[PDB]
Write a protein that binds this ligand. Structure first.
Ligand SMILES: CC(C)CCC[C@@H](C)[C@H]1CC[C@H]2[C@@H]3CC=C4C[C@@H](OC(=O)CCC(=O)O)CC[C@]4(C)[C@H]3CC[C@]12C
Ligand SMILES: CC(C)CCC[C@@H](C)[C@H]1CC[C@H]2[C@@H]3CC=C4C[C@@H](OC(=O)CCC(=O)O)CC[C@]4(C)[C@H]3CC[C@]12C
Ligand SMILES: CC(C)CCC[C@@H](C)[C@H]1CC[C@H]2[C@@H]3CC=C4C[C@@H](OC(=O)CCC(=O)O)CC[C@]4(C)[C@H]3CC[C@]12C
Ligand SMILES: CC(C)CCC[C@@H](C)[C@H]1CC[C@H]2[C@@H]3CC=C4C[C@@H](OC(=O)CCC(=O)O)CC[C@]4(C)[C@H]3CC[C@]12C
Ligand SMILES: CC(C)CCC[C@@H](C)[C@H]1CC[C@H]2[C@@H]3CC=C4C[C@@H](OC(=O)CCC(=O)O)CC[C@]4(C)[C@H]3CC[C@]12C
Ligand SMILES: CC(C)CCC[C@@H](C)[C@H]1CC[C@H]2[C@@H]3CC=C4C[C@@H](OC(=O)CCC(=O)O)CC[C@]4(C)[C@H]3CC[C@]12C
Ligand SMILES: CC(C)CCC[C@@H](C)[C@H]1CC[C@H]2[C@@H]3CC=C4C[C@@H](OC(=O)CCC(=O)O)CC[C@]4(C)[C@H]3CC[C@]12C
Ligand SMILES: CC(C)CCC[C@@H](C)[C@H]1CC[C@H]2[C@@H]3CC=C4C[C@@H](OC(=O)CCC(=O)O)CC[C@]4(C)[C@H]3CC[C@]12C
Ligand SMILES: CC(C)CCC[C@@H](C)[C@H]1CC[C@H]2[C@@H]3CC=C4C[C@@H](OC(=O)CCC(=O)O)CC[C@]4(C)[C@H]3CC[C@]12C
Ligand SMILES: CC(C)CCC[C@@H](C)[C@H]1CC[C@H]2[C@@H]3CC=C4C[C@@H](OC(=O)CCC(=O)O)CC[C@]4(C)[C@H]3CC[C@]12C
Ligand SMILES: CC(C)CCC[C@@H](C)[C@H]1CC[C@H]2[C@@H]3CC=C4C[C@@H](OC(=O)CCC(=O)O)CC[C@]4(C)[C@H]3CC[C@]12C
Ligand SMILES: CC(C)CCC[C@@H](C)[C@H]1CC[C@H]2[C@@H]3CC=C4C[C@@H](OC(=O)CCC(=O)O)CC[C@]4(C)[C@H]3CC[C@]12C
Ligand SMILES: *[C@@H]1O[C@H](CO)[C@@H](O)[C@H](O)[C@H]1NC(C)=O
Ligand SMILES: *[C@@H]1O[C@H](CO)[C@@H](O)[C@H](O)[C@H]1NC(C)=O
Ligand SMILES: *[C@@H]1O[C@H](CO)[C@@H](O)[C@H](O)[C@H]1NC(C)=O
Ligand SMILES: *[C@@H]1O[C@H](CO)[C@@H](O)[C@H](O)[C@H]1NC(C)=O
Lengths: 298, 13, 298, 13
């Protein structure tokens, strides 16, 4: 503490317009303000916050789903476990990414490819493969939720149609995620300072449209299946009510979160809200099973 | 409204 | 892109020893390296990760505990709700703190009190009050877990002794947290660039020792209560086994996390692992109730 | 081993 400068006593000076001087590949001065830097750090912290929420919610849902799911060896239980373990493992690799040398402001300000370690490239690839397997597990669950729920309906013509369309969408999104993954891998392995996000947007919209399709089918069907129970009988509080509530939640909240992720300001780190939408689309079914068992037991 | 942007090596969301 | 400097082609140069030039209250140059800066940002991101885990785990545990807890209007249920809502609200205020002007590198590098908004001081105070209420709710639960579990034991002499000591520890930690809070508030309100963490360490060790005491009592008691059931009867898989497992988990994991938080390297943002220890000490009881009901129902 | 440090205005952990 040699001596406090005059600007410590001025009540009008703001640090946000002050300039940082640092070295970069493009030039020598490359001035940047503390508010672009705090935007970068706030985006990184916001991504970390949502991925922490994902990791904690998925881990505790996995733990609770074991403690209480009496119907072990069901395919939907095994799929739900594979999906929760893949959410946890994806969140873990991402938690390394946020604390690595690609999310650091060292690389986001100074585009130096020497700072890059090839292990970080391998972590990037492992995360992309785990995301592909996650989408595969989610669509396996959904094709297994429409196949099983369409068994027993007299109108099996339209049930088979619905299974077919859903399964087509599942294969299309899984193939698009794998194509996006490999088209990002060849570019990253070749040049560490480039990206291929062209197919990303398409694969995420494909997944969102699949989820939207599922919530439509499950809500339409359950609506006709409580209208048939209201013209004869009544539908106000049975487990029927729990499935209908979770399917209306799956209808309204992940779509709202997808549009919120596509509408808000860019570069603020809010773009990973699509992962909260997929988190809730995953967590609708195990929580639905828990409520269903805890309203059937009585 | 905007397209999602991946930083030069951001793994998949 | 005027022209890439020579250091883009050198494979030996590392950005981590390069120096940032910026203005600060102490001087004019105030050189800092990108690796101290990335340490700061990594500490902030690590705090955000653990608080995201807290928020997601507590929110989904609150949601699940409603869906399945058939014993509504019990005091322990109401306390567990108050504690989960206070964990969520504390995590929310902290999530504002990490995205505010006190966790920004703008203030952690340039100690300018002009950048500080009085609303951030009010957020700081609200977070400290909510933490005091959280510790109060946790100790209310524990004094209510030892009071209720010690009812019915023939050896009520030592049961009352145990209740008394636990309740003394609860009041001591709540009073120490409130003293720490007010001693931090008067300093922050007076001078925004000072802190009073002297009483913090004492209050956290008091809370850790309370939790340790509880896990001792519950494990000792349940051990004599399965040794009496092993000399007459057998103790290998009953709900008895579920409480004993959760009490041994509460015995071993939060203490391990407390020592890990006190042992690892400082200034790396790992010091908030004490909040994961308190998170698990909270989440032992609702998960214990869920397993107990889901092993009593059959 | 170290004492927990609060930044100049870090709210309570
Ligand atoms: C659902 C919940 C209750 C399960 C338990 C999960 C926690 C025990 C996990 C989740 C997040 C984890 C943390 C995520 C990241 C880090 C940072 C890591 O250190 C670094 O990355 C710093 C590197 C550097 O110095 O640059 C040390 C472990 C730690 C604190 C982890 C410790 C274990 C934590 C708290
Ligand atoms: C019961 C389990 C299946 C779920 C609940 C706990 C997990 C979510 C925890 C347990 C172990 C944790 C991991 C322990 C150690 C690490 C290494 C850590 O590494 C770094 O941060 C390195 C940073 C650097 O090298 O710069 C990142 C978090 C991670 C994967 C943790 C992520 C969260 C994990 C998987
Ligand atoms: C599914 C749930 C239960 C989580 C399972 C744990 C794994 C996801 C974690 C545990 C330890 C982790 C590893 C710990 C350390 C490293 C070294 C690390 O080395 C580097 O390239 C970075 C070195 C550096 O920091 O300078 C690469 C990731 C890796 C293999 C980690 C990959 C992810 C692992 C296997
Ligand atoms: C929900 C059920 C009834 C099906 C509805 C019809 C689907 C087959 C449509 C609805 C939305 C469509 C998607 C809307 C937007 C895109 C992005 C498009 O690529 C881009 O726009 C990215 C590049 C760019 O424009 O910057 C590729 C096709 C795709 C995935 C479309 C594929 C066909 C989809 C899934
Ligand atoms: C199953 C249930 C419990 C889920 C409940 C989720 C909602 C309560 C969450 C999900 C997404 C959230 C939104 C995600 C992002 C934002 C943006 C956030 O910041 C801005 O609007 C930016 C303003 C600016 O530009 O300065 C305000 C809150 C809001 C709308 C959030 C409000 C609360 C929402 C709707
Ligand atoms: C799984 C269930 C039980 C909980 C769901 C909680 C989420 C809906 C919350 C948790 C973290 C929240 C985010 C935390 C921080 C921010 C940043 C915030 O923007 C700012 O902080 C200002 C702008 C900037 O900092 O650059 C906008 C809302 C957002 C995305 C929040 C939106 C709502 C989120 C995703
Ligand atoms: C309803 C569920 C299934 C989610 C899908 C919501 C759509 C209405 C969103 C998703 C992607 C959005 C588009 C993403 C990108 C842009 C930015 C912008 O694109 C442009 O035409 C100019 C910029 C450019 O060339 O990319 C104008 C809005 C548009 C087309 C958006 C219009 C609204 C879209 C189609
Ligand atoms: C009880 C359960 C069902 C609630 C589940 C959802 C909540 C955990 C979400 C809903 C609204 C969210 C909040 C919405 C907005 C914000 C503001 C955000 O900060 C900013 O936007 C920037 C502020 C600044 O500039 O300093 C920090 C996270 C926070 C408190 C979010 C924390 C997470 C909250 C409480
Ligand atoms: C109990 C669980 C379910 C969470 C409930 C949500 C609340 C904890 C959140 C929701 C919106 C939040 C508020 C959103 C915005 C602001 C303005 C914010 O104003 C400032 O001083 C900063 C302004 C700026 O960013 O420049 C102060 C915090 C406050 C009141 C937040 C306090 C915390 C609130 C009430
Ligand atoms: C678990 C049951 C059997 C009770 C055991 C005895 C307790 C009354 C002891 C055990 C640990 C003790 C604590 C250990 C350390 C401290 C920190 C001490 O303050 C400091 O060391 C902080 C200042 C500094 O040294 O930098 C104040 C007393 C306190 C809380 C002690 C209070 C008395 C405690 C709780
Ligand atoms: C019983 C069920 C319900 C929960 C089980 C959770 C445990 C598996 C978690 C709780 C605390 C966790 C630990 C908390 C913190 C850390 C430190 C973390 O980072 C380091 O050790 C730092 C290494 C370095 O200095 O680089 C490594 C994982 C570890 C041991 C975690 C491993 C996983 C643990 C034991
Ligand atoms: C077992 C459960 C109840 C958790 C408590 C573990 C204790 C064994 C820890 C908690 C706080 C620790 C202390 C925190 C700070 C320091 C740093 C350092 O302190 C000093 O005496 C020199 C520096 C200083 O004056 O603070 C040497 C270890 C010590 C005393 C630690 C010794 C081990 C302690 C007492
Ligand atoms: C930083 O860069 C600016 C160019 O805008 C220059 O005027 C200044 O001399 C450099 N050094 C400092 C301490 O600002
Ligand atoms: C960058 O600026 C400093 C300041 O004079 C100078 O010494 C250095 O030579 C400059 N770098 C190049 C490549 O000119
Ligand atoms: C940063 O400050 C130091 C000392 O004032 C100076 O020697 C150095 O040239 C400056 N860095 C740049 C890139 O100009
Ligand atoms: C800080 O360094 C710059 C570079 O010359 C100079 O213009 C400025 O006057 C210095 N600030 C003070 C208070 O001397």
């Amino acid at each position: 503490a040699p001596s406090l400068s005059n600007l410590f006593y001025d009540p009008t000076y703001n640090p946000g317009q002050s300039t940082i001087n640092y070295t970069s590949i493009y030039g020598n001065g490359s001035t940047i303000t503390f508010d672009e830097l705090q935007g970068l750090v706030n985006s990184t912290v916001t991504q970390a916050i949502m991925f922490g929420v994902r990791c904690g919610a998925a881990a505790l849902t996995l733990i609770v789903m074991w403690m209480t799911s009496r119907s072990r060896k069901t395919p939907i239980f095994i799929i739900n476990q594979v999906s929760l373990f893949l959410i946890i493992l994806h969140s873990a690799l991402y938690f390394k990414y946020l604390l690595s040398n690609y999310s650091s402001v060292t690389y986001a300000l100074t585009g130096f490819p020497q700072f890059i370690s090839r292990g970080d490239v391998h972590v990037y690839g492992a995360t992309n493969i785990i995301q592909v397997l996650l989408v595969a597990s989610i669509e396996t669950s959904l094709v297994f939720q429409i196949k099983v729920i369409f068994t027993g309906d007299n109108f099996k013509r339209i049930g088979l149609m619905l299974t077919s369309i859903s399964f087509t969408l599942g294969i299309a999104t899984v193939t698009m995620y794998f194509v996006s993954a490999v088209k990002g891998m060849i570019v990253t392995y070749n040049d560490v300072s480039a990206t291929q996000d062209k197919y990303f947007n398409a694969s995420t919209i494909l997944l969102a449209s699949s989820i939207n399709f599922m919530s439509f089918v499950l809500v339409v069907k359950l609506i006709l299946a409580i209208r048939s129970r209201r013209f004869l009988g009544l539908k106000q509080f049975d487990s029927f009510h729990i499935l209908l509530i979770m399917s209306c939640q799956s209808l309204l909240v992940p779509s709202i979160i997808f549009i919120l992720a596509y509408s808000l300001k860019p570069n603020q780190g809010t773009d990973v809200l699509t992962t909260v939408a997929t988190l809730l689309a995953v967590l609708s079914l195990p929580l639905s099973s828990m409520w269903a068992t805890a309203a059937n037991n009585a | 409204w905007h397209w999602l942007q991946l930083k030069p090596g951001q793994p998949m969301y």
